[PDB]
Ligand binder design. Structure first.
Ligand code: A1A1Q
Length: 301
């Protein structure tokens, strides 16, 4: 069971505007983005605010801390710039911005690059210089996914963009995965062997279809750090990205574990580095509430 541990809202706000979250390198502290563009650090057990930083002029949609704790990526809705990289050393400071990309991720093995997405286009940037190294787009192989997000594989050699597998070194598209849906572009399994594109699981060696998993339709997915569990939540067609439910799956065989309906719209979820806890941002009140008034709920896995 997910055992509820704590709940909290954004402090000194009439309406709570938490939108996204990620655990910090510090045990007990969660980073939360807000609908007015702030980044907050909270004690996840006591629900107390520790620090606040001004990041964007619009809602933070997504964020991602580097493992070493030194760097943070943020993305926003209708700001310019849409994404940015922040230093979390002495002074919280913007290192680089990514004017055109509405979503960004770090490289996975060595976190020296950022991959950004604009529509069906991937951009790869050097963290040090901020320089754009590669643009990845092939008009001949595009799938035109509506909710595309470009991503590196575990060893940083490959990129999946718009259902197309790219070799990063040669900057060549090596395979296009056929389109089976309008929206979801897919991710790499942390095992480095499989690609998960909506309901289709592809073998990365053969490009053969390994499994079909209907429950993953229209889902964003995230794995726990140890790569044993996969969380999925179905996108909706300051509105929540997701519905009221998320599902877990065994990462080794894609078998369903649990379906969790929180009966409230979900904005985000994340696990801690040790995969003990799950933090979920949920809107209070009722399904599809108009009022933006989110809480963070912490569960023990
Ligand atoms: N942090 C993570 O990576 C976890 C991940 N979060 C997001 O994917 C996410 C989390 N948030 C968003 C946007 C938020 C957004 O667009 N808005 C609209 C304006 C008001 C704020 C929310 C997204 C998101 C939506 C679409 C796209 Cl294609 C890209 C995305 F990143 C997740 C994985 C599995 C899950 F079960 C859950 Cl509940 C969450």
């Amino acid at each position: 069971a997910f055992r509820p541990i704590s709940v909290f809202r954004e402090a000194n706000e009439d309406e709570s505007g938490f939108t996204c979250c990620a655990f910090s390198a510090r045990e007990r502290f969660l980073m939360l983005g807000t609908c007015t563009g702030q980044l907050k650090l909270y004690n996840v057990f006591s629900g107390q605010e520790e620090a606040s930083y001004n990041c964007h002029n619009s809602a933070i949609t997504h964020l991602e801390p580097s493992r070493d704790g030194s760097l943070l990526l943020t993305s926003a809705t209708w700001s310019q710039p849409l994404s940015a990289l922040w230093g979390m050393k002495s002074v919280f400071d913007m290192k680089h911005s990514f004017t055109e990309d509405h979503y960004v991720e770090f490289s996975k093995h060595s976190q020296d690059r950022v991959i950004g997405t604009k529509g069906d286009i991937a951009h790869i940037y050097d963290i040090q210089t901020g320089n754009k190294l590669l643009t990845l787009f092939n008009p001949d192989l595009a799938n035109n996914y509506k909710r595309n997000c470009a991503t590196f594989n575990p060893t940083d050699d490959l990129v999946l963009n718009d259902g197309v597998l790219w070799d990063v070194r040669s900057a060549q598209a090596i395979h296009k995965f056929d389109k089976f849906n309008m929206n979801i572009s897919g991710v790499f399994h942390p095992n480095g062997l499989e690609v998960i594109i909506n309901t289709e699981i592809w073998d990365l060696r053969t490009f053969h279809l390994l499994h079909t998993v209907p429950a993953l339709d229209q889902c964003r997915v995230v794995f726990n750090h140890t790569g044993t569990v996969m969380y999925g939540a179905m996108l909706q067609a300051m509105k929540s990205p997701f519905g009221s439910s998320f599902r877990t799956f065994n990462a080794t065989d894609y078998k369903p574990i649990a379906t969790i309906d929180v009966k409230r719209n979900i904005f985000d979820l994340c696990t801690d580095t040790k995969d003990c806890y799950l933090a979920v941002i949920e809107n209070q009140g009722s399904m599809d509430a108009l009022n933006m008034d989110t809480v963070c709920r912490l569960y023990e896995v």
